[PDB]
Amino acid sequence: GAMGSMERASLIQKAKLAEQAERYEDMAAFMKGAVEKGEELSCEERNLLSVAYKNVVGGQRAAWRVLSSIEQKSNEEGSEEKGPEVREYREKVETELQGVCDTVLGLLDSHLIKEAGDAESRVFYLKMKGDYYRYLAEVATGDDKKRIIDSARSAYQEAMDISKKEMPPTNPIRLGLALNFSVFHYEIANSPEEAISLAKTTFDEAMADLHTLSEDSYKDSTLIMQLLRDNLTLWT
C-alpha cells in the first residue's frame, strides 16, 4: 500500500513516534504497513497494532454514540423535523467505523491468525477478532446482526478455549479476554447473568494464582482484575 516502500523496522519506529505524539491514525497506518510485510509480529508489535486501532475505533465509537443519541432524540414525539442531516452524518461516521473494523478483521484474516501458533499470539488475535466484531455489532441493525454477533461470540469462545488450556489464570491476555467477553455478554448478547458469572469466576481464579507471581506480574494482573471488579460493581 502507501507503506509498501518503507522498511518494516522504520514503520515500527514511526508507530512508536506516532504513539508519543498521540497521532493514532498515523500509528494505525504504520502498523498496518508493518503487518502487510508478511512477517509475524512480536509481542511488542502486537501491542502497538492493538493500541493504534483501539484508539482510532474508540474515538469513532464515542462520536457514533453522541450522534445516535441526537438521532434518537429527534425521533421522539414533539421533536421538530430537522431533515436528513443527523441520520446522514451518523451514517457517515458509522460507515467509517465499519471500515476500520473491516480493515482490522482483514489483517487478522490475511494472515495474522493462520500464522499464530503460540497461545500468546493466537489468543491475542482471536480476542481482537471478537472485539472488532463486537464493535460491528454495536452499530448493527440489519439482517446480518445475528451473524455479526455470532462471529464475535465464536472468536471469543475459541480464544477462551485456548487460554484456559494454555495460560495461567493470571495471564493478562487471558484476563483481558475474559473481561471483554463478559462485556460482550452484558452489552451485546443480552446475557447479563453470563457476564456476571464469567467476571466472578475469572476474578476468583486469578486471585487464587497471584501467589505464584513476581511483584511486577502481580501488578499487571491485579490491574485487570480491578476492571473485572469495576464491571461487577456496575452490574450488580
Partner: peptide, 6 residues
C-alpha cells in the same frame, strides 16, 4: 458509567 473493556 459504561462497561469497561481493555
Amino acid at each position: 458509567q459504561r462497561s469497561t473493556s481493555t
